[PDB]
Amino acid sequence: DTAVDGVFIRSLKVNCKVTSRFAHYVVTSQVVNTANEAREVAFDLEIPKTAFISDFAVTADGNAFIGDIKDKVTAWKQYRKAAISGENAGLVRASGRTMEQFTIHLTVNPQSKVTFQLTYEEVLKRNHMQYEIVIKVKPKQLVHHFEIDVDIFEPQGISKLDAQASFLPKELAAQTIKKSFSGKKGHVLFRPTVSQQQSCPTCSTSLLNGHFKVTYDVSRDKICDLLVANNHFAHFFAPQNLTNMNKNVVFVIDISGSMRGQKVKQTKEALLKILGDMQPGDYFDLVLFGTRVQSWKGSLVQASEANLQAAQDFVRGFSLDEATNLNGGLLRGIEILNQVQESLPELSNHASILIMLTDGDPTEGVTDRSQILKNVRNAIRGRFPLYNLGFGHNVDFNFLEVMSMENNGRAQRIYEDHDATQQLQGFYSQVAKPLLVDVDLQYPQDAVLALTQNHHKQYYEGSEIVVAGRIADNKQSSFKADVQAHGEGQEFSITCLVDEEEMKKLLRERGHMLENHVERLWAYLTIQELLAKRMKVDREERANLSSQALQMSLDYGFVTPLTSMSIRGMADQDGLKPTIDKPSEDPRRTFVLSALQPSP
């Protein structure tokens, strides 16, 4: 029998509906306690940090419980006088680089049937020429009816679709994973029988341990992907068949003593590989910063065979230099790229990129964090993006995120691990091939009530620009978009008009779910944008952005950093409600059913 201590997992189902990159997850688990005693049951799964929980329901023999979303402050008032912290008590916590762990332990009645259902949503982001859907599969028992169903609907059409299950042998995956796509519709169905779940023909344990990955991309022949539905729009921009731009890239590398060991080795290895794949038309230099600041050439040099080999030799040879002069290192790298303005104007049409890697905070020279931010942004002056890589967890990552945000870039975390070299290569490949610069998506001011970031410094091959917004009443029919940008010595310009007939056709094919997901796509991107914006503004404007993010989280019912989801009707030993939160970037209690709470 599958059951353990009288408890068996009758069914465990993951249902993912993807509509124009908006991914709607529903995970449903039904556990049955056949024992005549009380038994403890678990609902335990991993979800991506990028997603927002939107609903949670528990039904025990008709007794229904639902997560009520509210201001986080209100939800955590029960923790103030309590012996446990909300972080320790919460059902959700960080469990890895990109995933969070949702865990609840519940004492169920005898002869009981309990159904758990968790809903979470995200907008899939394109990277490396694909979208990726990752589902952590790990039932701590065999499941009678296990299913993963992914239903994809893309107006532009699906160009490719794949489904990989690492934990399954190639022969088992073939018979068990059903996938197909035609036109706008794609489907993946994974329905392993109990026999197919056992690791061995006559062993009790289940091989369903690992990750179920679904990847796809949409046809990009049609340069215009403007999707309008019920006063909300989503605009996807990723032109194909563009010529790679030549680029000027400077690497600013921390060589402080703390880098000693694996970090410097993995950093050097990544630089060697990056230099090895550089294209002849690019220009580059290298900057090292410890206590002293050091540049390989002091100016942008061409990526010739000799220069690349000399740079690789310089990478292999350098040694560490104690402290960390981050201000000097960045300003030096910026000075080199800015030579293109006066000394080297023949490189001015290239796309410029500045990448910085550090494992610690500034200890030499300018150490006032606010001053460094000022120094950097005043030197770059919006000419090129800055990509900060935080190596390990001794860096002030918020400091790195703000700096990149203030300079048309983003920050990325590098985890100290056996694959740090691949992480660095992985990130660089996202910015390695600029195709357009100064992308300006323009929409008629008379029609737009709200909109997301519409200016983007660089567009890279393999990635994508997405804009969403809300349309004013009676302006949807004539809605349009103009996209301007520059290539290397070229001007880019297109116009996208709503295809009214096509929208109605799409609405018929996908149903009213299309309207809802486009709006919720806008809400998701707007909330994320508010969370990003709030971190780089003064405390007064930060409160204003927070209130916008709070109100939108409540309106659309998202569990975000400003909201929590509480479950009335359950209590731990101290009478505390289950609480669900969004953990931040920086002892397992068990619950019982309790219908009473002290009256106010």
The residue within the footprint of Mg ion, chosen from 360, 469, 557, 561 (CB under 5 A), is: 360
For 49-85, give one letter per residue: b (16+ CB within 10 A) or e. Answer: bbbbbbbbebebeeeebbbebeebeebbebbeeeeee
| Contact stretch for Mg ion (CB under 5 A) within 336-344, 354-362, 486-494, 578-586 | 354-362
Instruction: Give residue for tokens 């490949």.
Output: 429
Closest approach of Cβ 258 to Mg ion, in Å? 3
d(C-alpha 88, C-alpha 195), whole Å: 38
Closest approach of Cβ 392 to Mg ion, in Å? 9
| Contact stretch for Mg ion (CB under 5 A) within 200-208, 234-242, 359-367, 502-510 | 359-367
Which residue, 212 or 391, is less far from Mg ion as judged by CB? 391
Contact characters 239-268, Mg ion, x per CB under 5 A: -----------------x-x----------
Give how far Cα 169 sits from Cα of 107, 165, 189, 208, Å.
36, 8, 17, 11
Q: Is 141 in the site for Mg ion (CB under 5 A)?
A: no
Closest approach of Cβ 41 to Mg ion, in Å? 47
Closest approach of Cβ 313 to Mg ion, in Å? 24
Which residue, 343 or 394, is less far from Mg ion as judged by CB? 394
User: 242: closest CA among 442, 460, 430?
Assistant: 460
| Contact stretch for Mg ion (CB under 5 A) within 72-80, 116-124, 353-361, 506-514 | 353-361
Closest approach of Cβ 543 to Mg ion, in Å? 34
Kindly state the tokens that stand for 286.
């290298």
Which residue, 57 or 320, is less far from Mg ion as judged by CB? 320
User: 291: closest CA among 371, 360, 375?
Assistant: 360
**Dihedral sign computed on CA atoms, order 496, 502, 503, 506:** negative
Strands 455-460 and 563-567 come out as unpaired
Instruction: Give the residue ranges of DSSP H helices in 85-217.
Output: 86-89, 170-176, 194-197
Closest approach of Cβ 346 to Mg ion, in Å? 37
The residue within the footprint of Mg ion, chosen from 359, 364, 401, 488 (CB under 5 A), is: 359
Q: How many residues bind Mg ion (CB under 5 A)?
A: 5
Quote the distance between the C-alpha of residue 456 and its chain's center: 18
Which residue, 207 or 424, is less far from Mg ion as judged by CB? 424
User: 482: closest CA among 224, 243, 95?
Assistant: 224
| DSSP 8-state class, residue 472 | P
Which residue, 258 or 463, is less far from Mg ion as judged by CB? 258
With vertex at residue 274, the alpha carbon angle to CA 252 and CA 214, rounded to the nearest 5 degrees, is 110
| Contact stretch for Mg ion (CB under 5 A) within 82-90, 101-109, 156-164, 358-366 | 358-366
Which residue, 184 or 332, is less far from Mg ion as judged by CB? 332
Instruction: Give the residue ranges of DSSP H helices in 390-538.
Output: 397-405, 420-431, 500-510, 513-534
What end-to-end distance do the CA atoms of the chain give, in Å? 49
Which residue, 175 or 394, is less far from Mg ion as judged by CB? 394
Instruction: Provide long-range contacts, Cβ within 8 A and 24+ apart, for 536-541.
Output: 536/402, 536/405, 536/406
| DSSP 8-state class, residue 220 | -
Which residue, 46 or 359, is less far from Mg ion as judged by CB? 359
Closest approach of Cβ 366 to Mg ion, in Å? 16
**Which residues in the 309-338 window bind Mg ion by CB under 5 A?**
324
Which residue, 192 or 392, is less far from Mg ion as judged by CB? 392
Minimal CB distance residue for Mg ion: 360
Contact characters 269-308, Mg ion, x per CB under 5 A: ----------------------------------------
Residues of this chain that bind Mg ion (CB under 5 A): 256, 258, 324, 359-360
